[PDB]
Amino acid sequence: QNITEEFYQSTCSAVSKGYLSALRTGWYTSVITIELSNIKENKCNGTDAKVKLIKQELDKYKNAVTELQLLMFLGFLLGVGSAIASGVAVCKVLHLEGEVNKIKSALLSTNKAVVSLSNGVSVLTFKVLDLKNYIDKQLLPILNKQSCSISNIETVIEFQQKNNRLLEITREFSVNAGVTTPVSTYMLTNSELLSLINDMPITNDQKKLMSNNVQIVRQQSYSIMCIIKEEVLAYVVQLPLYGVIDTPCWKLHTSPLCTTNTKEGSNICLTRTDRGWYCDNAGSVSFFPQAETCKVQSNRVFCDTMNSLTLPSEVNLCNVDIFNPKYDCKIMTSKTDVSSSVITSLGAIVSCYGKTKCTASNKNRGIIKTFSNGCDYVSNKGVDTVSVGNTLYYVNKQEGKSLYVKGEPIINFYDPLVFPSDEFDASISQVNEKINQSLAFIRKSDELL
Amino acid sequence: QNITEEFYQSTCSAVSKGYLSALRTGWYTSVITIELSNIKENKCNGTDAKVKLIKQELDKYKNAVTELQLLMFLGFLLGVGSAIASGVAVCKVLHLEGEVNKIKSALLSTNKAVVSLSNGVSVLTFKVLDLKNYIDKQLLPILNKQSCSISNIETVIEFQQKNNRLLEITREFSVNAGVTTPVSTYMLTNSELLSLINDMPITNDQKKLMSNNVQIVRQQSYSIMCIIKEEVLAYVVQLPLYGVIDTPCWKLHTSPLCTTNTKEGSNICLTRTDRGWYCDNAGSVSFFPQAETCKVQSNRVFCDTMNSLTLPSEVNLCNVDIFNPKYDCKIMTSKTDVSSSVITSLGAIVSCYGKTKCTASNKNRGIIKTFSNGCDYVSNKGVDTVSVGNTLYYVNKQEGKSLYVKGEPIINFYDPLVFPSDEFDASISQVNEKINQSLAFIRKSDELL
Amino acid sequence: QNITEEFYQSTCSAVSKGYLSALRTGWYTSVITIELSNIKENKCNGTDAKVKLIKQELDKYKNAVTELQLLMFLGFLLGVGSAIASGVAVCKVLHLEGEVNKIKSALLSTNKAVVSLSNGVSVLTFKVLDLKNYIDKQLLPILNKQSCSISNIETVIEFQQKNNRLLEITREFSVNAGVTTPVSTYMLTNSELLSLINDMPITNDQKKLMSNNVQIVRQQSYSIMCIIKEEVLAYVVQLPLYGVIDTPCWKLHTSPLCTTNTKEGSNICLTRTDRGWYCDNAGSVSFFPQAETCKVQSNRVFCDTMNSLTLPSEVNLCNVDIFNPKYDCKIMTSKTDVSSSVITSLGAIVSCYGKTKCTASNKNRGIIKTFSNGCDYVSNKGVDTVSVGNTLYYVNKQEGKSLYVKGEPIINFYDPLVFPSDEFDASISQVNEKINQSLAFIRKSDELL
C-alpha cells in the first residue's frame, strides 16, 4: 500500500512510482588475512589408519597452499569501466617489501586493526582464522620424526573442520582465476561481514541498509586473491558503498505500439526505447538501461552507477507528454507487427496485433477478458495469468493501485509511406525531420512540375 | 538415422528436420518443508572435546538458521515476462496468519499431503528433512546430561551428516538472495524430485520425459525462499510443466551470402535473420530466436515458451521459396564482405570471401577440399575438421543424411548501387519497395529531364 | 615500464602496445577413468550405529551411480561454432562395445597409457581414483562379517573421504547436464592436470605456459560426461592447445567523439567501432570484438579463436591516419550527445559533452582536472579516479608510459546537415559516398533550377 503504478495508453508504457533508490556510487576495500603455518616435514613411517588420515589431511592442507603459490533496447551508450580496478589497485600495493610485515605486525595481538600502507590509504584489516597456532603448536611437533602415534580421534575431526574453510577458499579462487563474485560465506562469514560493515565510514543508515540486505551486498562485492608472502594468506574483499539512499525511484515498462488497420502488412509500428530504471540522485536522473543490473527487495532498488547515464530531470516529461519541446524523447520505429506481452510490477502490458489470441485469465474463473488488437493494460488484482498466442505469462501478485491513463495511441497521427520505419535509437524530433525532409521532397517535387 | 538435414545453396542455410519438440508452456509450484527445533543454548561448563564439536556444529546449525531469518540476430521482439511470477505468487500467500500451521498440521503424520491454502490453490507438500525430531530426540537429551559426558563420537558424525544438507541449502540461498536455479540435489534429491513428478497433473508420458531427463528439468526449475515462521522452514520449488511434447521440430542455421566479384569492396552481402529453433505446437510455430535458450537431448528439444514468438505455418515457405507472395521472409543486408563459418547439426556452413583461405579436413588424410570463395556445405561423414583462416572449427559427429539443394545464389539477382545495404530487420518486400522507390527516383527524375 | 599506451587526440582512441599473445587455435581431448565397484546391498539386520553410517554413505555412493545412469560493439560478425564438438566426438566413440575393455585393460596395470581407438585417434587415458579396489579390498570384506560388527570408526571416515570426490563430480554433472566449465579440482586436481600437460604433444615452452596458468586453462576447458559402461566411469576432459604464442598483441579502447558546438542538439557524433583485442599470428591479425572473451594475466592475454575475425595487418593504419586509401576504417555515427567514460590499461578516455560535470580526482589532493567538453585522456600515474556526472569510475594502477598524440578531432571536418547520422556499422569510404551522394543531390538539384 506503498507502491503505485500508472499506465499510459497514449504511449503504450507504464511507470511504477512507489520505489526507493539504492545506488552503489563507490567502492570500499578491506584486507582479510589468514596466518598460515609452513611445514617441513611430517615424517611418520608405518601406515596406521590414524596416522594415514592426519597425513592425508595435512597433504590436503599443503596442496591448497601450493595451488595458491601457483596462482601468482539502448545500453550501448554506457561506455566501459573496470569493476575490480579499485580492488586490483589494493592488491598491487601489497606486493611491496615488508608491507606484509607491517600488516602482519599490527594483527598479532588483535584480530582487527587499521594500518596505513605506504600508498597512504588507511584500510580495515581482518585475521579471521589462525590455523597456524593450531598446526605449529599442536600438530607439527608430534609428527617429527620417525615415530608418530596419534590417539583420540576427535583431533583429526577438529583439524579437518578447521582446515575445511581454507580448502573452500582455495577451491573457489581456483575456479575464478582469483576474483570471485558474489563473495561466499567461506571467503567471509556473516559475523566477520557485519563486523566489517560497522567500521566502514558510512551513515548509520547506510550500515543499516547493508545489514538487512547482506545477501545483496555479497552479489555486488568482489574477493580478490593477492599474495601469500611471509606466513600469511591475504586477499582483499571489495564492498559496495551506497552514497545514494531514500531518493524516489521509478521503473519504466514499454512495448511495441502499432496501428491496427485491417490490411495484412502495410502497418506501422512504434516502440519507446528508453525502458529501464530511473532514479533521482543529484538533481539529475541516473538511468539504468539494462535492468538486469538492478536488484529489487520491495521498497529498495539496488543498482550500480557504472552501467548508467546521468540524464536531466526533464526526462519525466516523456511519460506525460511525449511531444514536449523541452526534451526529445528516445524511440524506435518498425514495420514489424509482432504480438508480445510485458509483465509490469503491478500488472501486464499486452501488445496484441494481427489474428493473435491475446487473453487474460483468473486461476478460478478462467478466461475473463479477450483483448481487441492494441496496447492495453490490466491490473494484477483481478487477473492471475496472461496468454499471448502459445506463450503463457504469469502476473506479479504484489499490492498496489494502478491507474489507466486514457489517450489516443500516438501512432495514429501519421500517414503511412511518409513514415520512417527503420529507426533503432532515433527520437521524436529526429523522426519529424525525416518526415519533414520527405514532406519537403514530396511537396517541393510537384510544385516545380 | 532419425535426424536429417537439408542445405539450400540458394539461401546459404540449413534445416535439421529430425527433431522432436519439448515445450515448457507452463509452471507447476510445490512447497518443500523442513521442521526445525527451537533451542536455547545450554549454559554448559563442560570442556569435553566431543561436546565442543557438537556445540560448534550446533552453532553452525544456529548460524544457518540466523542467515535465513536475515533474508526476510532478432530476439529483441520477444518481450519480457516474469519467470518466477508463478513461484513468487505462492510465497506471498504463505505469509498469512496460521497458514503455516495449516500445512504443519497435515504434515505431522505423513510426509506428503495436498493442502488447500486460503487463496484456494491446492499445493503438494513435502517434509523431506526432520531435524527437529533428530535434535529433540537424539541430540538434546544427550547434550543435557547434567554431566557433559557424551559417550561415543558417532553422535557428532550423525549430526554433522544430517545437519550438512540444511547447511548447503542455507548456503545456496545465501548466495542467491533466496532464489536458486537450477534446483540442486541438496535442494531436492533425485528420489524426492522423481516422487514429485508423479503427482504433477500431467500425462504418464510427460512424467516419463521428465524422469529420464531430471538434469534438464532441474535447469528449467526455480527454488524460492519464503518464510521460516513457526518452527518450520519452507521454500517453494517451481517446476516446468511441458504442455507441448512430440511435435516435429527443426533448427534453422543461417550464414552470410555475398557476391564474389573480383573487386576489393564494392560487394553486396545478404543474410537470413530468422535463425533459431522452430517447433509445431498449436497449428502454429513457436520460434526461439536465441537458440542458446534451447537444450538438446538427441530426439528431444527443450525450449521455454516465454522467450518465443508464435508464428503462422507459412514460415516453412522461407526455406523453399524466398520470393513467395504468402510470407514476407525476414532478412538483413550489408556491404561487409567478411569470412566466417556456421556449424550445423550434421555439418558446417562455410562463407568464404575475398583472399581468405578456406579449407575442410579429415583427421587422417588432412586437407580434402579447398573452397572457391562462396557458400558451401559439407557432410559430417567424410569430414572431421574445417579451417577458415586462423580460426579452426570442429564438426559434429552425429549420424544422419544431408541433402544438397542446388540453386543460384539469390544475391546475384540484384544490381549494385540501387541495392539498400543498411538493413537490420527488414524483409523481402521492404527491400523491393526501397529498390522500387529508388527505382522510381532514378526513373522519374530522368523522364522529367 | 614494459607495457605502453598511446592516445590519439585526432581520433579519440587509445592503443595499449605492451601485450603478448595467447591464442587457443585448437583442442586436445583426454579420457579420464574411474574404476567402479559392482555391489549388491547386504540384507543386514545389524543395527550398529557405525554400520548404519557406512550403509548410509554407501547409498550416497549408489545414488550417485544411479544419477549417472539416468544421465545416459561488434561480435555479431563472428558466426557460431560448437565448443564441445571435439569432446562430443570422442564421447561418441567411447560408446562402442569393447572400446571400454580396450582401455580398461591397458589401465589395469598402469594408471597411464596411450590407447588407439577404432576411429584411429590416439588418446591419453587416466585412472585417477580406484574406488573399486578400495571398496572390494577394504570395505566389502568388512561389511559382510556375518555379525554386523565394525570395530573402529576410522573405517567410515576413510570411506566418506574417498567417496566425497565422486559425489561432487556427480553433483556438478547433475547441475550441468553433463557438461561443466570450468573443470573443477574435484573433476581434476592440480597434480593430475600438471601430469596431463607433459604428455600433450606441444612445445616445451607451451607446457611451461599452461603450468603457470592452470586456473586459466580450467576456464577455457570443458569436462564431458560420457558413459558408465562395464564397471568403470569415464568422462572426457577437453583441454585447449595454444598454437600461437609470444607474438605481439594490442588492446584498442574507443570512445564517442562529438562536436562541441554550443547548440542543444544539432550536434554530430562519431565513433570508431573496432574496439577489442588485436593480435599478430600468421602475417595477419586475429581480432576479438567482445573483450569479455579474453582473460588477462599481465604480460599474457588469453583468447579463444572461435570468437574472432582474421584481418590484414594494414588495419593499424586506421590508428595513425584514418583516411589512408589502403584500408577502409570501421566507424559509427549518431546524433546522441551523451557523456561517458572509458577506462584504459594505463588511463582513461573521457568523452565529455553538454553541461555535464566531467572530472578527474586524486585520492589525496582531490579534484585535479575539470574537462573542457571533449575527448581527453589522463595518465594513471598522477591520477587515481575519474568522475563523469553522477557515476564514478576507478582507474587502473598498472605501470607504464602513455603518450598523448596531438591532432584535431576528425569530427570537426564534416559540415552539418549533409552529415549522415544514423549509421551503426558503416565506414570511412561508405560515409563519403553518402556524403557525396547527398552532396550531389544538393549540387545537381540546383544547377537545373
Coordinates of C-alpha atoms in Angstrom, one line a residue, chain A residues 1-444:
Chain A
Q1 CA 0.0 0.0 0.0
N2 CA 3.2 2.0 -0.7
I3 CA 4.0 1.2 -4.4
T4 CA 1.8 2.5 -7.2
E5 CA 1.8 2.3 -11.0
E6 CA 0.4 4.2 -13.9
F7 CA -0.3 3.1 -17.5
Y8 CA -0.2 5.5 -20.4
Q9 CA -2.4 4.2 -23.3
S10 CA -1.1 7.1 -25.4
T11 CA 2.4 5.8 -25.4
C12 CA 1.9 2.1 -24.5
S13 CA 4.0 2.4 -21.4
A14 CA 3.8 2.2 -17.6
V15 CA 5.6 3.8 -14.7
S16 CA 5.9 2.5 -11.1
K17 CA 6.5 5.3 -8.7
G18 CA 6.4 3.6 -5.3
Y19 CA 10.1 2.7 -5.2
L20 CA 13.1 3.9 -3.2
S21 CA 16.7 4.1 -4.5
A22 CA 19.8 2.1 -3.6
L23 CA 22.8 3.3 -5.6
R24 CA 26.3 1.8 -5.2
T25 CA 28.2 5.1 -6.1
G26 CA 31.6 3.8 -4.8
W27 CA 33.8 1.0 -3.5
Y28 CA 35.4 0.2 -0.1
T29 CA 38.4 -2.1 0.0
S30 CA 39.3 -4.2 3.0
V31 CA 42.1 -6.7 3.7
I32 CA 41.3 -10.1 5.1
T33 CA 44.3 -12.1 6.4
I34 CA 44.9 -15.7 7.4
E35 CA 48.0 -16.6 9.3
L36 CA 49.3 -19.8 7.8
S37 CA 51.7 -22.4 9.1
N38 CA 54.7 -23.5 6.9
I39 CA 55.5 -27.2 7.2
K40 CA 58.7 -29.3 6.6
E41 CA 58.4 -32.0 7.1
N42 CA 55.9 -34.5 8.5
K43 CA 57.9 -37.7 8.7
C44 CA 55.8 -40.5 10.1
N45 CA 56.5 -44.1 8.9
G46 CA 54.2 -47.1 9.4
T47 CA 50.7 -46.9 8.0
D48 CA 48.3 -46.7 10.8
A49 CA 44.7 -45.7 9.9
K50 CA 45.0 -42.9 12.5
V51 CA 48.5 -42.0 11.0
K52 CA 47.3 -42.1 7.4
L53 CA 44.4 -39.8 7.9
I54 CA 46.2 -37.0 9.6
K55 CA 48.9 -37.2 6.9
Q56 CA 46.3 -37.2 4.2
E57 CA 44.6 -34.2 5.7
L58 CA 47.9 -32.4 6.1
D59 CA 48.6 -33.3 2.5
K60 CA 45.3 -31.6 1.6
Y61 CA 46.4 -28.6 3.6
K62 CA 49.8 -28.3 1.8
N63 CA 48.3 -28.8 -1.7
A64 CA 45.9 -25.9 -1.1
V65 CA 48.9 -23.7 -0.2
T66 CA 50.8 -25.0 -3.3
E67 CA 47.8 -24.1 -5.5
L68 CA 47.8 -20.6 -4.2
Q69 CA 51.6 -20.3 -4.8
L70 CA 50.9 -21.4 -8.3
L71 CA 48.3 -18.6 -8.9
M72 CA 50.9 -15.8 -8.5
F73 CA 17.0 -1.5 -26.4
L74 CA 19.7 1.1 -25.8
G75 CA 22.5 0.2 -23.4
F76 CA 25.3 0.6 -26.0
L77 CA 25.8 4.2 -24.8
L78 CA 27.1 3.4 -21.3
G79 CA 30.8 3.1 -22.0
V80 CA 33.2 0.7 -20.2
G81 CA 34.9 0.6 -16.8
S82 CA 36.9 -1.8 -14.7
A83 CA 34.8 -3.3 -11.9
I84 CA 37.8 -4.5 -9.9
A85 CA 40.1 -1.7 -10.8
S86 CA 39.8 -0.4 -7.2
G87 CA 40.4 -3.8 -5.7
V88 CA 43.3 -4.7 -8.1
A89 CA 44.9 -1.4 -7.0
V90 CA 45.0 -2.6 -3.4
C91 CA 46.5 -5.9 -4.4
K92 CA 49.3 -4.2 -6.2
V93 CA 50.4 -2.2 -3.2
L94 CA 50.5 -5.4 -1.1
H95 CA 53.3 -6.7 -3.4
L96 CA 55.8 -4.4 -1.6
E97 CA 58.8 -5.4 0.5
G98 CA 57.9 -5.8 4.2
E99 CA 54.5 -4.3 3.7
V100 CA 53.2 -7.7 4.6
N101 CA 55.3 -7.4 7.8
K102 CA 53.7 -4.1 8.6
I103 CA 50.3 -5.6 8.5
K104 CA 51.4 -8.9 10.0
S105 CA 52.7 -6.8 12.9
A106 CA 49.5 -4.9 13.7
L107 CA 47.3 -8.0 13.7
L108 CA 49.4 -10.1 16.1
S109 CA 47.6 -9.0 19.2
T110 CA 44.1 -8.2 17.9
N111 CA 42.2 -9.6 15.0
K112 CA 41.2 -6.2 13.9
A113 CA 43.2 -3.0 13.1
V114 CA 43.6 -0.1 10.6
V115 CA 47.1 0.1 9.1
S116 CA 48.3 2.9 7.0
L117 CA 50.1 1.5 4.0
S118 CA 52.8 3.3 2.1
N119 CA 50.2 4.4 -0.6
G120 CA 48.9 6.4 2.4
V121 CA 45.4 4.8 2.2
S122 CA 44.1 3.5 5.6
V123 CA 42.5 0.1 5.3
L124 CA 40.5 -2.1 7.7
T125 CA 42.3 -5.4 8.2
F126 CA 41.0 -8.8 9.4
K127 CA 42.6 -12.0 10.8
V128 CA 39.7 -14.5 10.7
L129 CA 41.4 -17.9 11.0
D130 CA 44.6 -18.9 12.8
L131 CA 45.4 -22.5 11.7
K132 CA 49.0 -21.6 12.3
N133 CA 48.8 -21.6 16.0
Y134 CA 46.9 -24.8 16.0
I135 CA 49.1 -26.6 13.4
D136 CA 52.5 -25.5 14.6
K137 CA 51.9 -26.0 18.3
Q138 CA 49.6 -29.0 18.5
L139 CA 50.2 -30.9 15.3
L140 CA 53.7 -30.4 13.9
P141 CA 56.0 -31.3 17.0
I142 CA 54.3 -34.8 17.3
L143 CA 54.9 -35.7 13.7
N144 CA 58.6 -35.4 13.8
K145 CA 60.3 -37.6 13.3
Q146 CA 60.1 -41.4 12.7
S147 CA 57.5 -42.4 15.4
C148 CA 54.1 -40.7 15.2
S149 CA 51.2 -42.2 17.2
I150 CA 48.0 -40.2 17.1
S151 CA 45.4 -41.1 19.7
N152 CA 42.0 -39.5 20.5
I153 CA 40.4 -39.5 17.1
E154 CA 38.3 -36.3 17.7
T155 CA 41.5 -34.4 16.9
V156 CA 41.5 -35.3 13.2
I157 CA 37.9 -34.2 13.0
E158 CA 38.9 -30.8 14.5
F159 CA 41.7 -30.3 12.1
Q160 CA 39.6 -31.2 9.0
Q161 CA 36.9 -28.8 10.4
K162 CA 39.4 -26.0 10.8
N163 CA 41.2 -26.8 7.6
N164 CA 37.9 -27.0 5.6
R165 CA 37.3 -23.3 5.4
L166 CA 40.8 -22.8 3.8
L167 CA 40.0 -25.6 1.3
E168 CA 36.8 -24.0 0.0
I169 CA 38.6 -20.7 -0.3
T170 CA 41.4 -22.3 -2.2
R171 CA 38.8 -24.0 -4.3
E172 CA 36.8 -21.0 -5.3
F173 CA 39.7 -18.8 -6.3
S174 CA 40.8 -21.8 -8.4
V175 CA 37.7 -21.8 -10.4
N176 CA 37.5 -18.0 -10.7
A177 CA 41.2 -17.0 -11.6
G178 CA 41.5 -15.3 -8.2
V179 CA 38.4 -13.0 -8.4
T180 CA 35.1 -14.3 -7.1
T181 CA 31.6 -12.8 -7.2
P182 CA 29.5 -12.9 -5.4
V183 CA 31.6 -13.3 -2.2
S184 CA 30.8 -16.6 -0.5
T185 CA 30.4 -17.3 3.2
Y186 CA 33.7 -19.3 3.1
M187 CA 35.5 -16.2 2.0
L188 CA 33.9 -14.0 4.6
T189 CA 31.4 -15.1 7.2
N190 CA 28.4 -13.1 8.2
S191 CA 29.8 -12.1 11.7
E192 CA 33.0 -11.1 10.0
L193 CA 31.0 -9.3 7.4
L194 CA 28.7 -7.4 9.9
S195 CA 31.9 -6.5 11.8
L196 CA 33.3 -5.2 8.5
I197 CA 30.3 -3.1 7.9
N198 CA 30.5 -1.2 11.3
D199 CA 33.9 0.4 10.8
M200 CA 33.2 1.5 7.2
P201 CA 32.9 5.3 7.3
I202 CA 29.3 5.5 6.1
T203 CA 26.0 6.6 7.6
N204 CA 24.4 4.7 10.4
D205 CA 21.5 4.4 8.0
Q206 CA 23.9 3.1 5.3
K207 CA 25.2 0.4 7.7
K208 CA 21.5 -0.4 8.5
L209 CA 20.8 -0.8 4.8
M210 CA 23.6 -3.2 4.2
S211 CA 22.9 -5.3 7.3
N212 CA 19.3 -6.1 6.4
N213 CA 20.4 -7.0 2.9
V214 CA 23.8 -8.8 3.4
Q215 CA 22.8 -11.2 0.7
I216 CA 22.6 -8.3 -1.8
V217 CA 25.9 -6.8 -0.7
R218 CA 27.6 -10.1 -1.4
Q219 CA 26.4 -10.1 -5.1
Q220 CA 27.8 -6.6 -5.6
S221 CA 31.1 -7.5 -3.9
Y222 CA 34.4 -8.9 -5.1
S223 CA 37.0 -11.1 -3.5
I224 CA 40.5 -10.7 -5.0
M225 CA 43.4 -13.1 -4.4
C226 CA 46.6 -11.1 -3.7
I227 CA 49.6 -12.6 -2.1
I228 CA 50.8 -15.4 0.2
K229 CA 54.2 -13.8 1.2
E230 CA 55.6 -14.5 4.6
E231 CA 53.4 -16.9 6.5
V232 CA 50.1 -15.2 5.9
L233 CA 47.4 -15.5 3.3
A234 CA 45.9 -12.2 2.3
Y235 CA 43.0 -11.4 0.0
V236 CA 41.1 -8.1 -0.4
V237 CA 37.3 -8.1 -0.1
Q238 CA 35.7 -5.3 -2.2
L239 CA 32.5 -4.0 -0.7
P240 CA 29.9 -1.5 -2.3
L241 CA 29.5 1.9 -0.7
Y242 CA 25.9 3.3 -1.1
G243 CA 26.2 7.0 -1.3
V244 CA 22.6 7.4 -2.5
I245 CA 19.7 6.3 -0.3
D246 CA 16.0 7.0 0.1
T247 CA 15.5 9.0 -3.1
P248 CA 12.4 8.4 -5.2
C249 CA 12.8 5.7 -7.8
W250 CA 10.7 4.5 -10.8
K251 CA 10.8 1.7 -13.4
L252 CA 9.6 2.3 -17.0
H253 CA 8.0 -0.6 -18.9
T254 CA 7.5 -0.3 -22.7
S255 CA 6.0 -2.3 -25.5
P256 CA 5.6 -2.1 -29.3
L257 CA 2.7 0.2 -30.4
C258 CA 1.3 -0.2 -33.9
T259 CA -1.7 0.8 -35.9
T260 CA -4.5 -1.8 -36.2
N261 CA -5.6 -1.2 -39.8
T262 CA -7.2 -4.2 -41.4
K263 CA -4.6 -4.9 -44.1
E264 CA -2.1 -7.8 -43.9
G265 CA 1.2 -5.9 -43.7
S266 CA 1.3 -2.2 -44.7
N267 CA 1.3 -1.5 -40.9
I268 CA 3.5 0.8 -39.0
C269 CA 4.9 0.1 -35.5
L270 CA 6.4 2.3 -32.8
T271 CA 8.3 1.5 -29.6
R272 CA 9.7 3.6 -26.8
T273 CA 13.4 2.7 -26.3
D274 CA 14.1 4.4 -23.0
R275 CA 13.0 1.5 -20.9
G276 CA 14.6 0.7 -17.5
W277 CA 15.1 2.1 -14.1
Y278 CA 15.4 5.8 -13.3
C279 CA 16.5 7.5 -10.1
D280 CA 16.7 11.0 -8.6
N281 CA 20.2 11.5 -7.0
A282 CA 21.9 14.8 -7.7
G283 CA 19.3 17.0 -9.3
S284 CA 19.6 14.8 -12.4
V285 CA 18.4 11.3 -13.0
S286 CA 20.6 8.2 -13.1
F287 CA 19.3 5.9 -15.8
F288 CA 19.9 2.2 -15.9
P289 CA 19.2 0.8 -19.4
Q290 CA 19.8 -2.9 -18.7
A291 CA 17.5 -3.6 -15.8
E292 CA 19.3 -6.9 -15.1
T293 CA 21.8 -4.8 -13.2
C294 CA 19.2 -3.7 -10.7
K295 CA 18.0 -6.0 -7.9
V296 CA 14.7 -5.5 -6.2
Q297 CA 13.7 -6.0 -2.5
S298 CA 10.3 -4.4 -2.5
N299 CA 10.9 -0.8 -1.3
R300 CA 14.6 -0.8 -2.1
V301 CA 16.1 -0.9 -5.7
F302 CA 19.8 -1.9 -5.8
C303 CA 21.8 -0.5 -8.8
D304 CA 25.4 0.0 -9.9
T305 CA 26.2 3.5 -11.2
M306 CA 28.8 2.2 -13.6
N307 CA 26.2 0.9 -16.1
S308 CA 24.3 4.2 -16.1
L309 CA 23.8 7.5 -17.9
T310 CA 23.1 10.7 -16.0
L311 CA 20.1 12.4 -17.5
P312 CA 18.3 15.8 -17.0
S313 CA 15.2 15.9 -14.8
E314 CA 13.2 16.8 -17.9
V315 CA 13.2 13.1 -18.8
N316 CA 10.0 12.6 -16.9
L317 CA 8.1 14.7 -19.3
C318 CA 8.3 11.9 -21.9
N319 CA 5.9 9.9 -19.8
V320 CA 3.2 12.5 -19.6
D321 CA 3.6 14.5 -22.9
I322 CA 6.0 12.9 -25.4
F323 CA 5.7 16.0 -27.7
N324 CA 7.1 18.5 -25.2
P325 CA 9.6 21.0 -26.7
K326 CA 11.9 20.6 -23.7
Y327 CA 13.1 17.0 -24.2
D328 CA 13.5 14.9 -27.3
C329 CA 12.1 11.5 -26.2
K330 CA 14.0 8.4 -27.4
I331 CA 12.1 6.0 -29.6
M332 CA 12.2 3.3 -32.3
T333 CA 10.1 2.6 -35.4
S334 CA 9.4 -0.6 -37.3
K335 CA 7.1 -2.4 -39.8
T336 CA 7.4 -5.5 -37.6
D337 CA 3.9 -6.1 -36.4
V338 CA 4.5 -8.8 -33.8
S339 CA 2.5 -9.7 -30.7
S340 CA 4.2 -9.9 -27.3
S341 CA 3.5 -9.0 -23.7
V342 CA 5.3 -7.2 -21.0
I343 CA 4.8 -8.0 -17.3
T344 CA 5.0 -5.0 -15.2
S345 CA 5.3 -4.5 -11.4
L346 CA 1.6 -4.4 -10.7
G347 CA 0.2 -5.7 -13.9
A348 CA 0.9 -6.6 -17.5
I349 CA 1.1 -4.6 -20.8
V350 CA -0.3 -6.6 -23.7
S351 CA 0.7 -5.7 -27.3
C352 CA -1.9 -7.6 -29.3
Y353 CA -1.7 -7.5 -33.1
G354 CA -2.9 -9.4 -36.1
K355 CA -5.0 -12.6 -35.6
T356 CA -3.1 -13.5 -32.5
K357 CA -5.1 -14.6 -29.5
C358 CA -4.5 -12.3 -26.6
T359 CA -6.2 -13.2 -23.3
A360 CA -6.2 -12.7 -19.6
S361 CA -7.3 -15.3 -17.1
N362 CA -8.0 -15.9 -13.4
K363 CA -7.0 -19.1 -11.7
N364 CA -10.6 -19.7 -10.6
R365 CA -12.9 -18.4 -13.3
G366 CA -10.6 -18.9 -16.3
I367 CA -10.7 -16.5 -19.2
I368 CA -12.1 -13.2 -18.2
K369 CA -11.1 -10.8 -21.0
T370 CA -10.3 -11.0 -24.7
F371 CA -8.2 -8.2 -26.0
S372 CA -9.2 -6.1 -29.1
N373 CA -5.9 -5.7 -31.1
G374 CA -3.9 -2.9 -29.4
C375 CA -1.9 -1.8 -26.4
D376 CA -3.8 -2.4 -23.2
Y377 CA -3.1 -2.9 -19.5
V378 CA -4.8 -5.0 -16.8
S379 CA -4.4 -4.9 -13.0
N380 CA -2.8 -7.7 -11.1
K381 CA -5.7 -7.9 -8.7
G382 CA -8.5 -9.3 -10.8
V383 CA -6.0 -11.3 -13.1
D384 CA -3.6 -14.1 -12.4
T385 CA -2.5 -15.2 -15.8
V386 CA -1.9 -13.9 -19.3
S387 CA -1.6 -15.9 -22.5
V388 CA -0.3 -14.4 -25.7
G389 CA -0.6 -16.9 -28.5
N390 CA 1.1 -20.1 -27.4
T391 CA 3.2 -18.4 -24.8
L392 CA 1.8 -18.0 -21.3
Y393 CA 2.9 -15.2 -18.9
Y394 CA 2.4 -15.3 -15.1
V395 CA 1.5 -12.0 -13.4
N396 CA 3.0 -10.4 -10.3
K397 CA 1.0 -10.6 -7.1
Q398 CA 2.1 -7.5 -5.1
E399 CA -0.2 -4.9 -3.6
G400 CA -0.7 -1.5 -5.1
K401 CA -3.0 0.7 -7.1
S402 CA -2.7 1.1 -10.8
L403 CA -4.0 4.0 -13.0
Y404 CA -5.2 3.7 -16.6
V405 CA -4.4 6.9 -18.4
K406 CA -6.7 7.1 -21.5
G407 CA -5.4 8.7 -24.6
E408 CA -5.4 8.2 -28.4
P409 CA -2.4 6.0 -29.4
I410 CA 0.1 8.3 -30.9
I411 CA 0.9 6.1 -33.9
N412 CA -2.5 7.1 -35.5
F413 CA -1.4 10.6 -36.3
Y414 CA 1.0 9.6 -39.1
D415 CA 0.2 8.9 -42.8
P416 CA 1.9 5.7 -43.9
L417 CA 4.5 5.8 -46.8
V418 CA 6.0 9.1 -45.5
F419 CA 6.8 7.4 -42.2
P420 CA 10.4 6.4 -41.5
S421 CA 10.2 2.8 -40.2
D422 CA 13.7 1.6 -39.8
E423 CA 14.9 3.5 -36.7
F424 CA 16.7 1.9 -33.8
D425 CA 17.8 4.6 -31.4
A426 CA 16.1 7.7 -33.0
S427 CA 13.8 10.2 -31.4
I428 CA 10.7 12.4 -31.9
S429 CA 12.5 15.3 -33.4
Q430 CA 14.8 13.0 -35.4
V431 CA 11.6 11.4 -36.9
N432 CA 9.9 14.7 -37.6
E433 CA 12.8 16.0 -39.7
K434 CA 12.9 12.9 -41.9
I435 CA 9.2 13.2 -42.4
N436 CA 9.7 17.0 -43.0
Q437 CA 12.6 16.1 -45.4
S438 CA 10.2 13.7 -47.0
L439 CA 7.4 16.2 -46.7
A440 CA 9.6 18.8 -48.4
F441 CA 10.8 16.4 -51.1
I442 CA 7.2 15.2 -51.8
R443 CA 5.8 18.7 -51.6
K444 CA 8.6 20.6 -53.5

